[PDB]
Amino acid sequence: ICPKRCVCQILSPNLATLCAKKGLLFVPPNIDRRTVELRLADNFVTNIKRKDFANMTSLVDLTLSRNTISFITPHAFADLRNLRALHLNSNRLTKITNDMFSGLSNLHHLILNNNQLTLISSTAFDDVFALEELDLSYNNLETIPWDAVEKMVSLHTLSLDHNMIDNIPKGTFSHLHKMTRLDVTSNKLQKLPPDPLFQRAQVLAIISPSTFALSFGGNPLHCNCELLWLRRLSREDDLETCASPPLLTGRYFWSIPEEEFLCEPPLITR
Amino acid sequence: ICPKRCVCQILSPNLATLCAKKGLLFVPPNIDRRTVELRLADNFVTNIKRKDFANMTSLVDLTLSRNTISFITPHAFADLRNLRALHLNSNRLTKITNDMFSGLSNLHHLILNNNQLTLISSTAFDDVFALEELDLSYNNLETIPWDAVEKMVSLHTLSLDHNMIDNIPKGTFSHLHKMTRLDVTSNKLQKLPPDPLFQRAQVLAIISPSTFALSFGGNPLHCNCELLWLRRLSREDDLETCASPPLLTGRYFWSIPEEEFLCEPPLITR
Numbered sequence: 001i002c003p004k005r006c007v008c009q010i011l012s013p014n015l016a017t018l019c020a021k022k023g024l025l026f027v028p029p030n031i032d033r034r035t036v037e038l039r040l041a042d043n044f045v046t047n048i049k050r051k052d053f054a055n056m057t058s059l060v061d062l063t064l065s066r067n068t069i070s071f072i073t074p075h076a077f078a079d080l081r082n083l084r085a086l087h088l089n090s091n092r093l094t095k096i097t098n099d100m101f102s103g104l105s106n107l108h109h110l111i112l113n114n115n116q117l118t119l120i121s122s123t124a125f126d127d128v129f130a131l132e133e134l135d136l137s138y139n140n141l142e143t144i145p146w147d148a149v150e151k152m153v154s155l156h157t158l159s160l161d162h163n164m165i166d167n168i169p170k171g172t173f174s175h176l177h178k179m180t181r182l183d184v185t186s187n188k189l190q191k192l193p194p195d196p197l198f199q200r201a202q203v204l205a206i207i208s209p210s211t212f213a214l215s216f217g218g219n220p221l222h223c224n225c226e227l228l229w230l231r232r233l234s235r236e237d238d239l240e241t242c243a244s245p246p247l248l249t250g251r252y253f254w255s256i257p258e259e260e261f262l263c264e265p266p267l268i269t270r
Numbered sequence: 271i272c273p274k275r276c277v278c279q280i281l282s283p284n285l286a287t288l289c290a291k292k293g294l295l296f297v298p299p300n301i302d303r304r305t306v307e308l309r310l311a312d313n314f315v316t317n318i319k320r321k322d323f324a325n326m327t328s329l330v331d332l333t334l335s336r337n338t339i340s341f342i343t344p345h346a347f348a349d350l351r352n353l354r355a356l357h358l359n360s361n362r363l364t365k366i367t368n369d370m371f372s373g374l375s376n377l378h379h380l381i382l383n384n385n386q387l388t389l390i391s392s393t394a395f396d397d398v399f400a401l402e403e404l405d406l407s408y409n410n411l412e413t414i415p416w417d418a419v420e421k422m423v424s425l426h427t428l429s430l431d432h433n434m435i436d437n438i439p440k441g442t443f444s445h446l447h448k449m450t451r452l453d454v455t456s457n458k459l460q461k462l463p464p465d466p467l468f469q470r471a472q473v474l475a476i477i478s479p480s481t482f483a484l485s486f487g488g489n490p491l492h493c494n495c496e497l498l499w500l501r502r503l504s505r506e507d508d509l510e511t512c513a514s515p516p517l518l519t520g521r522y523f524w525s526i527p528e529e530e531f532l533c534e535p536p537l538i539t540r
């Protein structure tokens with residue numbers, strides 16, 4: 001049942017298959033299909049085939065953390081109907097196809113951090129709409145399918161720090177009431193959309209603790225009146241820095257008074 | 271002299287310019303050119319220009335660790351004649367041009383780990399021939415200019431783990447007598463060249479400690495008689511794993527007896 005290297009243990013009624021730190025180069029063939037937890041972390045798997053995780057209906061937690069995974073066969077996660085958590089962090093993934101995460105309705109946690117992700121095809125998140133956590137940190141992403149993200153009502157954590165994200169839609173986080181943490185540090189963002197969740201990121205006074213936590217440091221901010229709503233907020237200085245206008249270039253976001261966040265009236269050239 | 275954010279300190283006769291964790295987006299303009307140590311680590315610099323480190327002749331240690339650096343202007347390190355240590359780890363670098371590291375004769379330590387390096391043009395290491403440490407770990411490299419490496423006699427540390435290196439020349443490490451550590455873990459190596467330095471990686475008996483330390487785990491080894499020289503060595507099991515022949519696929523490198531490492535005689539087809 002349990003592969004030679006793996007230490008599969010049994011606790012009624014669940015079956016766990018522990019194959020972490022075993023120097024594996026590929027996913028072991030004879031893993032019991034009625035396994036519930038499967039740890040394949042800290043190995044050297046380079047690619048996944050359909051035959052690996054096929055037929056595993058009872059699987060609820062899969063861990064492929066810290067591998068050399070660069071490609072996974074389309075429809076290899078298709079039969080994981082009861083999977084709730086997937087760890088694909090610290091690999092060599094490049095793209096996110098639609099066939100990759102298909103049928104993962106019960107998926108609540110999806111982790112893709114420390115990968116070299118460049119593109120995420122739309123509708124790739126059209127089956128994981130009911131997740132609660134999404135970690136896409138430390139990637140080469142500049143855009144994500146926000147439309148599929150807007151359909152994630154039960155989402156409470158969105159990790160996006162250390163990417164190259166250009167901008168972010170204004171209509172997002174509208175019905176995402178359960179959101180409690182958003183990290184967009186070290187991205188190439190020019191501005192930020194206003195939202196009541198961000199109003200909930202203050203420390204105010206009785207005294208009150210911040211119930212929402214956002215991070216927007218390390219961004220080429222365009223310090224105009226379109227960010228004035230965020231400057232009016234009362235938050236701790238997180239070393240944020242303006243990049244433009246040239247007069248505000250270099251000075252801290254919180255070191256600049258509200259009367260210096262200005263915009264420019266429209267005029268007609270021809 | 272010292273930039274607004276930076277904390278430049280003076281100890282006779284050296285001048286250090288400390289600008290770490292200041293939320294910088296670019297290298298500050300007015301850094302004193304007669305600085306000796308310059309810490310720009312933990313910021314958000316995206317690209318380097320010639321005007322940044324130009325004219326800094328007295329600089330002996332430059333630290334650009336953990337930035338968003340993706341491109342550096344050719345001949346931007348040209349005038350760093352007295353530079354001995356360079357830290358470019360944890361960035362977004364892709365390529366290593368010849369103009370990049372030109373004239374760095376006195377460079378003894380070069381660190382490029384945790385970058386997305388794909389290619390290293392030859393002759394890029396034709397000026398750093400007198401270095402002592404080279405960290406190219408955690409990159410997408412498959413080949414490096416070995417010819418330029420062979421001219422590094424005073425080299426004692428070569429970090430190459432977690433890449434995609436295909437193979438490695440047999441004539442290397444010939445005159446590199448000062449070599450004391452080589453890490454080639456998590457690479458796509460099929461085999462390994464024999465070397466007296468590897469004979470110095472044993473624990474033998476009086477009792478003796480290993481004076482050389484090499485690591486070759488996480489590699490698709492081709493367990494034939496061409497690796498039999500390494501199997502005959504007496505070393506600690508580092509979870510190494512064979513990938514071929516198919517009969518030896520999956521079994522540990524050290525769990526296989528020496529009599530099973532076989533090769534195949536030549537025959538003529540036509």
Ligand SMILES: *[C@@H]1O[C@H](CO)[C@@H](O[C@@H]2O[C@H](CO)[C@@H](O)[C@H](O)[C@H]2NC(C)=O)[C@H](O)[C@H]1NC(C)=O
Nearest residue numbers: 029030031033049050051052053054055056079
């Ligand atoms: C997935 O499950 C099926 C059974 O549910 C496995 O067994 C058979 O697969 C062969 C294919 O060569 C079919 O001809 C049989 O009809 C299947 N059996 C039954 C009872 O339907 C199949 O091998 C499993 N596949 C993998 C990749 O594990």
Ligand SMILES: *[C@@H]1O[C@H](CO)[C@@H](O[C@@H]2O[C@H](CO)[C@@H](O)[C@H](O)[C@H]2NC(C)=O)[C@H](O)[C@H]1NC(C)=O
Nearest residue numbers: 299300301303319320321322323324325326349
């Ligand atoms: C590098 O050093 C030179 C001086 O060694 C700096 O000063 C002058 O640069 C201008 C260029 O517009 C020349 O016309 C002058 O002849 C230079 N002065 C001398 C005394 O030669 C130069 O600005 C420095 N460059 C940078 C980028 O810092």
